[PDB]
Amino acid sequence: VNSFSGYLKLTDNVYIKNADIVEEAKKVKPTVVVNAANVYLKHGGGVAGALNKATNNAMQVESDDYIATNGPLKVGGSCVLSGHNLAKHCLHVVGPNVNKGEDIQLLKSAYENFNQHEVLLAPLLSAGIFGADPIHSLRVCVDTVRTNVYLAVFDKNLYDKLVSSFL
Ligand SMILES: O=C1CC[C@@H](c2ccccc2)N1Nc1ncnc2[nH]cc(Cl)c12
């Protein structure tokens, strides 16, 4: 039993809710919150901008030191950093951005990073301003992640479109 509440169960291990991941994180303080990152960990907008703002820019400061030491992530890759005031850890995961030209086959690889963590609070990867179809993304998530994932979908209209159509 964990402290998440109000989620619709999609499968044995995937749950979904119409919520802001930032507010969910502040309420639950999960072990792992997933950021929808880019390879540079430049947290400008979307989920990343919102999470970083909630940390008072501490996420960005930590991220810049990470990149200065290690260089950029791979598309489809991830790194574990601090969760600051929002969670124990933040798993920064890079889904492909098709508005940048990135290969959507890499979305499965991105979701595979979730399997290294027993429980996660996450957004849909590559959706929103990353330009991919959120219905597709949800399907890849369900077909790839085997650990317990709690998905927060902020957009109400999209959320309604997703659950009622989830096969
Ligand atoms: O509604 C959706 C579906 C796709 C995803 C998205 C991911 C990357 C960039 C833009 C959007 N998204 N946004 C969020 N999901 C949960 N919490 C959130 N807090 C603030 C925002 Cl934006 C947000």
Provide the CB-side half-sphere exposure for 50 (13 A, CA): 15
**Range(s) of the domain holding residue 154:** 8-163
Residue 119 has phi, psi (to 5 degrees) of -140, 135
25 alpha carbon – ligand 1 mean position (Å): 13
Supply the residue whose CA is at minimum distance from atom 5 of ligand 1: 128
- Greatest CA separation found in the chain? 45
Alpha carbon separation from 73 to 40, 143, 162 (Å, rounded)? 7, 24, 29
Is 133 a domain residue? yes
Is 94 a domain residue? yes
Is 2 a domain residue? no
CB of 149 closer than 6 angstroms to any ligand 1 atom: no
Is 3 a domain residue? no
Method for structure elucidation: X-ray
Whole-number Å distance between alpha carbons of 118 and 71 = 27
CB of 159 closer than 6 angstroms to any ligand 1 atom: no
Q: What residues contact residue 56 under an 8 Å CB cut-off, 6+ apart?
A: none
CB of 125 closer than 6 angstroms to any ligand 1 atom: no
Is 124 a domain residue? yes
Is 15 a domain residue? yes
CB of 138 closer than 6 angstroms to any ligand 1 atom: no
Residue 61 tokens read as 């400061």
Angle, CA 93 vertex, CA 87 and CA 99 arms, to 5°? 130
Structural domain count of the chain: 1
3-state secondary structure of 148: strand
Is 91 a domain residue? yes
Contact between residue 63 and residue 146 where contact means Cβ atoms under 8 Å apart: no
Is 1 a domain residue? no
Q: What is the CATH number of the domain that holds 71?
A: 3.40.220.10
